[PDB]
């Protein structure tokens, strides 16, 4: 049970797994934000106030939200990175509140980012075809 859920955050004995990647302009904190679960499914939301990585935080909730118990749980933040694997279920970042409250009623998830943009579940080479949209993640 751990201090609020199973920290898990790195490999898994064997969990589902789920993506989560969104992509809003830091330098205004807004744009979109979704995910897809291996049950196919796809969900988007606009940020607001949220970091760059906070816009992948907020997504994070989505591939949370129909994770189920255990999941893999592949985002693009260093951020999350270090507050979302540090339980935050009232620490730091406000997203990171709500994300973890729902990792509260399940088992755990997955979190990983390496140094780059591009590394998540299905993008297959390509985002969503980038010209120059106000979404960009710093």
Same mark, same amino acid.
């Given at each position: 049970?751990?201090? /609020?859920?199973?920290?898990?955050? @790195? ?7 789920? +993506?989560?990647? %969104? ?20 969900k988007v939301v606009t940020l607001t106030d949220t970091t760059n990585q ?9 591939? /949370?939200?129909?994770?189920?118990? @255990? ?7 260093? +951020?999350?990175? %270090? ?15 709500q994300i973890i409250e729902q990792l509260i009623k399940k088992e755990k998830?997955?979190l990983a980012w390496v140094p780059a943009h591009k590394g998540i579940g ?17």
């Open positions: 049970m751990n201090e /609020l859920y199973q920290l898990e955050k @790195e490999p898994i004995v064997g969990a589902e797994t789920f +993506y989560v990647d %969104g992509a809003a302009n830091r330098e205004t904190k807004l744009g979109k934000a979704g995910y897809v679960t291996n049950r196919g499914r796809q906070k816009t992948e935080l907020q997504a994070i909730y989505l591939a /949370l939200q129909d994770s189920g118990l @255990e999941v893999n749980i592949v985002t693009d933040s260093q +951020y999350a990175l %270090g507050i979302i694997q540090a339980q935050p279920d009232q620490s730091e970042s406000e997203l990171v509140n998830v997955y299905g993008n297959e080479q390509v985002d969503k075809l980038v010209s120059a949209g106000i979404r960009k993640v710093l």
